Design a binder for these strands. Structure first.
Ligand SMILES: [Mg+2]
Ligand SMILES: [Mg+2]
Ligand SMILES: [Mg+2]
Ligand SMILES: [Mg+2]
Ligand SMILES: [Mg+2]
Ligand SMILES: [Mg+2]
Ligand SMILES: [Mg+2]
Ligand SMILES: [Mg+2]
Ligand SMILES: [Mg+2]
Ligand SMILES: [Mg+2]
Ligand SMILES: [Mg+2]
Ligand SMILES: [Mg+2]
Ligand SMILES: [Mg+2]
Ligand SMILES: [Mg+2]
Ligand SMILES: [Mg+2]
Ligand SMILES: [Mg+2]
Ligand SMILES: [Mg+2]
Ligand SMILES: [Mg+2]
Ligand SMILES: [Mg+2]
Ligand SMILES: [Mg+2]
Ligand SMILES: [Mg+2]
Ligand SMILES: [Mg+2]
Ligand SMILES: [Mg+2]
Ligand SMILES: [Mg+2]
Ligand SMILES: [Mg+2]
Ligand SMILES: [Mg+2]
Ligand SMILES: [Zn+2]
Lengths: 86, 165, 98, 51, 97, 73
RNA sequence: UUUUUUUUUUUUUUUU
RNA sequence: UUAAAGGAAUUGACGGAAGGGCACCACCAGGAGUGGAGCCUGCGGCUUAAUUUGACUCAACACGGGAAACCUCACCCGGCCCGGACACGGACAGGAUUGACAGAUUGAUAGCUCUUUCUCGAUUCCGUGGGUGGUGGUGCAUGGCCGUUCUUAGUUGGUGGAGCGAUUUGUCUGGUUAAUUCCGAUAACGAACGAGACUCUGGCAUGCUAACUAGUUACGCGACCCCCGAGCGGUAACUUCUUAGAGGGACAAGUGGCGUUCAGCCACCCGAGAUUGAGCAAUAACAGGUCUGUGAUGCCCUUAGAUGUCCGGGGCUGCACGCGCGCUACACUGACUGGCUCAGCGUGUGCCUACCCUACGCCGGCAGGCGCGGGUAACCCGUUGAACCCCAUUCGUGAUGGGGAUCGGGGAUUGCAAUUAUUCCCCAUGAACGAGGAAUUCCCAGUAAGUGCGGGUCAUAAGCUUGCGUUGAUUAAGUCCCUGCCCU
């Protein structure tokens, strides 16, 4: 049919912007050198910040958490809140 | 091997009220019929009717009243004299609105115009005890275009719960 | 359409026995309404009473589905039909008070 | 003869009114088979109250 | 051995226990009390109108089935004496041995 | 509306049976001035045709009450 | 501040 | 040419006329939305043999409790039977009445009809009067019922004044109230209905009623584990949580203040609660809906080739479309896999006339199939292990895994049969849809929305209904600006 849409509300966000499936060693040095060295870290923060996919973001960040380097605050259902200690 | 719950025999003897009383006025409309009394005697069924002409309940030597008893034996399945019919003369003969409507019907049917009829029972009701009375007769009177007619004596409450008694 | 010869003379029997029969409305075609008295459904029962209502014999009283009947002394004068079939024997309905 | 085919042993043909013999409106199983067109008229006889 | 009480107007029901007990506990008896069963309500909703006109307003009918249970363990020649009691018409007192 | 009905003449009053018979129907024969000669056959007693006679057909033979029709190849 | 406009035959009355 | 124009004065109504007042079917501050798309279920326009028909602003369009496969059907295409009661005349068959095997026939095993010729008894059948049947017409002739004007405070009668009379005062200047609710004034006085009062009920308690079909303590007895008399669940005394009856208390009863002497308003005290939600409703009307609810019915129409009737197929379900209420949605507050944990009203078989829920167990992917117990019921189904939600895993901002119509191949249940409608399940196709335009609807507190269950037609059968809950907001508490209503 004809989608003669009476409404008008445009202005969409960013053109289906691309995102990295799996990391590089450019990314890995971007990871191991400053993904602690912020002050506040969410996997949602680092996903938009460095253009990394969030399933890979919780992949990488839990790994430097698994060594114990990242000092989180808690975990619940929705959110996993990090910090850098020292 | 005859059991039904109280959610069934209450409504079964609920409609047994309706089935009994409105039938009895179709055969005993001739006087001013009033209504029935269904008590409980567990090996009988005591059924006492109120009406105006008790001689039109009695019969000749005990004929009409026992015959209407066996009417009930055939369909209701309450046989063998368990159904019993007695009567009550309406002593306060102008009190029950039902018979006041009822004899009003017959006076219409042989002439005796509705003016003379409706004031005739409004006179009869208000001499006999009552303090509220309003007869509503709306029909085809004095032409095709139905003209609604009303008559009122006494004192008529139209709201609150205690209308029902 | 017509009853057998036993069916007529026995439903004249029971109605002269008891004075009152019971029926119901439903006329034979979706459902087959007999009685617990007589073993034929309804068109027989209605064909019985259509003559018995016509001459003025047995008065009809109706209640919301099931028929009832009624008898008057005008009936019993004009019940010379079945007062004929036995001799003068009136049942324990009209006869007496104790 | 052919006075009856089509069973009606369930469905619409079974449920009847106890007061006026009709089946347009729905009919219930309450110890009571009514239309609702003539249920409300005759509840004031059998004792149903609105509260 | 027990007696079930089921009725409709509760003024009659409290007095049909009282007509039980006023006629009971001056005999040599061991009688229990009126155990309150929950009064049941079979509700009925109706369209209020045979046709489809107007606003959509519903009548809402309710019966209320009161029920209590009383208990008598005894010989039955007292039960055949308490059988002889005048009764309110909307009261159905069933028996159970 | 205005629905007036009458027939378009496909079918007519094809009648229920006009009971065409003889004057009376005669069945028995007197011989030797008194010998019973019964011409239309008696019927096997299924408590119908013990006194009921048979209608002749080409090879069918009818029973009046309950239609025990006597037949062979 | 506006806020303009919708055809036709169709309406009987005593008394207790 | 016309049977009316005119005059004052009164009751309405209307008023973009002036003063008071009220409403969330009005708004402001808000929400949820619908209107955009998909789907469902109604209405108008197409087509058909039929697409049965009522309703056409609020005051129709999830209404007929209308969720139909056949019924339900009043619609169409075809086929059986009479309910011609009743009585007259008449073949009355010198008693001969219908029914039927089978061939044939057709959707049919219709004895429909034809062939052939047995049963059967005076109810026959012929023709005239008739009645009788009609989901026929007509709700613009009706009864009842319904809503509406109309959810607001209004409404009259009697007597006495005023006026020739229509009519009027009472029914008011005021203050006040949700209110013609009250206090004063006053040619009025006495009254009434409606509002209240009443009732179900929300609410509260008692240590009144008192419970092996509802509890509870400990005494038993067993079982678990560190064992330490203790810690969680299974087999004599009280009704504290379940239950439902009598009786109690909410009245502004005290203080402050504003108040004609008042009526009353407003804060606070102790109190569960300072008014919860309703239900029943005023006189008078619409030519508002229903003749398709009726053994409520008037008048016209129809009745043997039937506008009676069953039976057999088809329609009401058709789609270039337009409108209505809804439902899941449009994603990360999220989607998925699992672990956790807790409801309230109500429902259930041999009935005054056609008829169930389900415990446990086995089989089967799933829907389902089999045997046994229990429920005509606080026993049992059921300490209804209700969902939303919550605790972790993946996805990661992607018309994607958000979204589930259409379409493919099957597997099951009910049924007289589910085709051109079922229902349920599985894989598979993965559709528009980016927070919805000018306009409008619903809502002040356990209220709105998000989320589930039970009841009504039910054999299968809920998106709608009507009740029950559960997480439980936002902004108000004011006006006459919009729409409308009330008093002068
Ligand atoms: Mg009228
Ligand atoms: Mg101008
Ligand atoms: Mg005015
Ligand atoms: Mg607004
Ligand atoms: Mg919406
Ligand atoms: Mg839309
Ligand atoms: Mg139509
Ligand atoms: Mg609507
Ligand atoms: Mg109409
Ligand atoms: Mg009308
Ligand atoms: Mg009317
Ligand atoms: Mg004067
Ligand atoms: Mg005046
Ligand atoms: Mg208690
Ligand atoms: Mg009123
Ligand atoms: Mg109209
Ligand atoms: Mg009718
Ligand atoms: Mg008539
Ligand atoms: Mg239709
Ligand atoms: Mg639309
Ligand atoms: Mg998608
Ligand atoms: Mg899906
Ligand atoms: Mg709107
Ligand atoms: Mg249910
Ligand atoms: Mg339901
Ligand atoms: Mg529906
Ligand atoms: Zn009916």
């Amino acid at each position: 049919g004809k989608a003669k849409k009476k409404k008008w509300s445009k202005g969409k966000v960013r053109d289906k912007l691309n995102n990295l499936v799996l990391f590089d060693k450019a990314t890995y040095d971007k990871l191991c050198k400053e993904v602690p060295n912020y002050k506040l870290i969410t996997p949602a923060v680092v996903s938009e910040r460095l253009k990394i996919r969030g399933s890979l973001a919780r992949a990488a960040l839990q790994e430097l958490l698994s060594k114990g380097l990242i000092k989180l605050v808690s975990k619940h259902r929705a959110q996993v809140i990090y910090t850098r200690n020292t | 091997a005859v059991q039904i719950s109280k959610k069934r025999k209450f409504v079964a003897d609920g409609i047994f009220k309706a089935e009994l009383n409105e039938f009895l006025t179709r055969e005993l409309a001739e006087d001013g019929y009033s209504g029935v009394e269904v008590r409980v005697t567990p090996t009988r069924t005591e059924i006492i009717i109120l009406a105006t002409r008790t001689q039109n309940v009695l019969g000749e030597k005990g004929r009409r009243i026992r015959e209407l008893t066996a009417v009930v034996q055939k369909r209701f399945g309450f046989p063998e004299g368990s159904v019993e019919l007695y009567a009550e003369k309406v002593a306060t003969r102008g009190l029950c609105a039902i018979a006041q409507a009822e004899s009003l019907r017959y006076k219409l049917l042989g002439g005796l115009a509705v003016r003379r009829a409706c004031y005739g029972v409004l006179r009869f009701i208000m001499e006999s005890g009552a303090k509220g009375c309003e007869v509503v007769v709306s029909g085809k009177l004095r032409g095709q275009r139905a003209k609604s007619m009303k008559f009122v004596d006494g004192l008529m409450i139209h709201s609150g719960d205690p209308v029902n008694y | 359409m017509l009853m057998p010869k036993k069916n007529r003379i026995a439903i004249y029997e029971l109605l002269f026995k008891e004075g009152v029969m019971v029926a119901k409305k439903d006329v034979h075609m979706p459902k087959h309404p007999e009685l617990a008295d007589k073993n034929v459904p309804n068109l027989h029962v209605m064909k019985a009473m259509q003559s018995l209502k016509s001459r003025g014999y047995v008065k009809e009283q109706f209640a919301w589905r099931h028929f009832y009947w009624y008898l008057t002394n005008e009936g019993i004068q004009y019940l010379r039909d079945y007062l004929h079939l036995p001799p003068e024997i009136v049942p324990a309905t009209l006869r007496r008070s104790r | 003869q052919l006075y009856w085919s089509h069973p009606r042993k369930f469905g619409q043909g079974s449920r009847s009114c106890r007061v006026c013999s009709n089946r347009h409106g729905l009919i219930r199983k309450y110890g009571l088979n009514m239309c609702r067109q003539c249920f409300r008229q005759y509840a004031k006889d059998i004792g149903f109250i609105k509260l | 051995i027990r007696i079930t009480l089921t009725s409709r107007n509760v003024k009659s029901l409290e007095k049909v226990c009282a007509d039980l007990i006023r006629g009971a506990k001056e005999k040599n008896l061991k009688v229990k009390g009126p155990v309150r069963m929950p009064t049941k309500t079979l509700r009925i909703t109706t369209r209020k109108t045979p046709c489809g006109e107007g606003s959509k307003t519903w009548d809402r009918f309710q019966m209320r089935i009161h029920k209590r249970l009383i208990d008598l363990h005894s010989p039955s020649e007292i039960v055949k004496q308490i059988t002889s009691i005048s009764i309110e018409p909307g009261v159905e007192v069933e028996v159970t041995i | 509306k205005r629905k007036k009905k009458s027939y378009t003449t496909p079918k007519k009053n094809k009648h229920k049976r006009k009971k065409v018979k003889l004057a009376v129907l005669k069945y028995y024969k007197v011989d030797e001035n008194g010998k019973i000669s019964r011409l239309r056959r008696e019927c096997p007693s299924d408590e119908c045709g013990a006194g009921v006679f048979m209608a002749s057909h080409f090879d069918r033979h009818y029973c009046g009450k309950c239609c025990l029709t006597y037949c062979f190849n």
